[PDB]
């Protein structure tokens, strides 16, 4: 795998989004991986519905948090609608996937990256955007403005995001806190420290969709 990966340069990453006050990051994270794998497999970049996963993933807890894996499993089981068809409302409502017509995309399955292994995650990122989790509760992370972020941060993960690239000393992360946070909505998080957890627990729980 190469020294640098940046799926934005490959046209596989949609504009940065803002989840608002709702604890829906798990759905945003899942959607970035779906947008990426559909572009990789089909050549088209489309935006998908975070709101649909928020409403319809019965394993997750709406705006009270949830599971990227469960959201990805829903897309493999059933499918997902375009964002335009099922736009983001920032509040969990009744699942409306039966009343929105046929699904726009469908995946084949969901695979977990071997946890607590930076190279395994880099290998995954070299193939496609990956859903990852990190500790975002620290003000150091909350106030991040740019550069390669080293912390301070612990490994009490609480926030799902998406890894869309990497370089020799960082992993490139698409956050869901709007374009005014970080580097136009992104953070570069230091890698190569030899911590198994990853900086801010970044290697704790990583999933990606499979699409034949
Ligand atoms: C993300 C956010 O917008 O803050 C959101 O809180 C979330 O997805 N949290 C996850 C933490 C990481 C993705 C690991 C989470 O805590 N999920 C667990 C489900 C919520 C807890 N239980 C209940 N019953 N609500």
Ligand 1, atom 7, lies closest to the CA of 65
CA of 131 from ligand 1 middle (Å) equals: 14
List the domain boundaries for the chain: 1-212
CATH of 1-212, one of 3.10.20.30, 3.20.20.300, 3.90.70.10, 3.40.309.10: 3.90.70.10
Rg, C-alpha atoms of the chain: 16
User: Burial, 61: exposed, middle or buried (Cβ in 10 Å; 0-12, 13-18, 19+)?
Assistant: middle
Nearest residue by C-alpha to atom 20 in ligand 1: 65
Show the CA angle centred on residue 187, arms to residues 160 and 189, nearest 5°: 85
Q: Is 200 helix (H, G, I), strand (E, B) or coil?
A: helix
Active site residue ranges: 25, 159, 175
What resolution in angstroms does the PDB record give? 2.5
Experimental method reported for this structure: electron diffraction
Q: Quick one: 212 exposed, middle or buried, by C-beta within 10 A (0-12, 13-18, 19+)?
A: exposed
**Could you give the C-alpha distances from 196 to 30, 37, 115, 168, 204, in angstroms and in order?**
23, 27, 9, 17, 9
CA 208/CA 36 separation, integer angstroms: 10
Q: Given ligand 1 and candidates 158, 162, 205, 206, which is best to mutate, with the most ligand atoms within 8 Å of its CB?
A: 158
Contact 65, 198 (CB under 8 A): no
- CA–CA separation, 164 and 37 (whole Å): 11
Q: 149: Cβ–Cβ under 8 A, 6 or more apart, which residues? A: 140, 141, 187, 188, 189, 190, 199, 200
């Amino acid at each position: 795998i190469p020294e640098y990966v940046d799926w934005r340069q490959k046209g596989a990453v949609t504009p940065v989004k803002n989840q608002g006050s709702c604890g829906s990051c798990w759905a945003f994270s899942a959607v970035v991986t779906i947008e990426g794998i559909i572009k990789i497999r089909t050549g088209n970049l489309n935006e998908y519905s975070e709101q649909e996963l928020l409403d319809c993933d019965r394993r997750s807890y709406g705006c009270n948090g949830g599971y990227p894996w469960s959201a990805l499993q829903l897309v493999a089981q059933y499918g997902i609608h375009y964002r335009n068809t099922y736009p983001y409302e920032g509040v969990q409502r009744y699942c409306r996937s039966r009343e929105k017509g046929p699904y726009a995309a469908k995946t084949d399955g969901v695979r977990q990256v071997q946890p607590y292994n930076e190279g395994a995650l880099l290998y995954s990122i070299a193939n496609q955007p990956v859903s990852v989790v990190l500790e975002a509760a620290g003000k150091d992370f909350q106030l991040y403005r740019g550069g390669i972020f080293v912390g301070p941060c612990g490994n009490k993960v609480d926030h799902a995001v998406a890894a869309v690239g990497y370089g020799p000393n960082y992993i490139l992360i698409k956050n869901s806190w709007g374009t005014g946070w970080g580097e136009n909505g992104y953070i570069r998080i230091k890698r190569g420290t030899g911590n198994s957890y990853g900086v801010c627990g970044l290697y704790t729980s990583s999933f990606y969709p499979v699409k034949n």
